[PDB]
Amino acid sequence: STGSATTTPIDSLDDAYITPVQIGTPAQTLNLDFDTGSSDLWVFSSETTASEVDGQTIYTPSKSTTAKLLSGATWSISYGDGSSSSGDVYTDTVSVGGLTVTGQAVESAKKVSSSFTEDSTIDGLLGLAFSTLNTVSPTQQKTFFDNAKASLDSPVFTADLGYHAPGTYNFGFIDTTAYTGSITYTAVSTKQGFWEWTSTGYAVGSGTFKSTSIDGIADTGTTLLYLPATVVSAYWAQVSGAKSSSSVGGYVFPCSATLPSFTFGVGSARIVIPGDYIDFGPISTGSSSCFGGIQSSAGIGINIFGDVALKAAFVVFNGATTPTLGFASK
């Protein structure tokens, strides 16, 4: 079997992408943030503290004939940005673009942090990292991808994120019409539960390519590109007037500047991120200082190839017994 669903940016900056997901019987459609950096499927629900819900569509297990409470199970998650949520666990039928999984763990939020309440467009998250990171206690639960793997034509899913435009998540097949050239595959380490890989180097604009190993994770759930301080300083040095601002919390640049592209290596292949992808607009309404899409990972502890990088490529998440990541230009 296969599945295919359109994913849409939530705002004019591509801060995140939402994908409709059908839960329960009859279907309740929620717009979830597909996150290859986490492994919990959790949703705003009828159980969420009323004051913490602001416009989100909620899952109501009591209206689903296939929902079953998972007795005694709880979940609690904290994301690298400081967001957090927690609650209890149901099992229900979950469908993504024609692909159906029965008995999927659906984690019902009882409490959500403020950053989730204020994001009216995101009804929850669908984790696509490895199931070792799932937070359900005392019995760990499998991701949607792990549960679908056996019945998929091929144990893969692909992320084709658009720049200021809709894109596609495909499960179980690789659309050979969606990319140009060849797909370059690279080894993945699952030791931390992430889609972790090693980039072979970088270049700034039309500059010389620097061969150097950058270990990082492919994370559809992170907006920006977080890279080591040496690399990030080399990039922003090519932008007149750019500086790191402690009050803003990152590199900013004059909104009148033109940004150079950024190239990253995948084996012997190169993925080019156009400079416009790195512009995230004024730091406040009406400001002439703009926020940069490439930032330092020094405070984080790990390098993150977020949406800024991933949306420049067609990306294959190969969940075979030896997992790999594929990158192609598009």
Ligand SMILES: NCc1ccc(C(F)(F)F)cc1
């Ligand atoms: N998108 C999920 C996510 C968020 C943060 C991190 C961090 F900070 F731990 F790297 C990993 C994964």
Ligand SMILES: NCc1ccc(C(F)(F)F)cc1
């Ligand atoms: N990396 C996971 C993640 C995804 C979205 C959000 C937001 F946008 F809701 F804050 C936080 C954390």
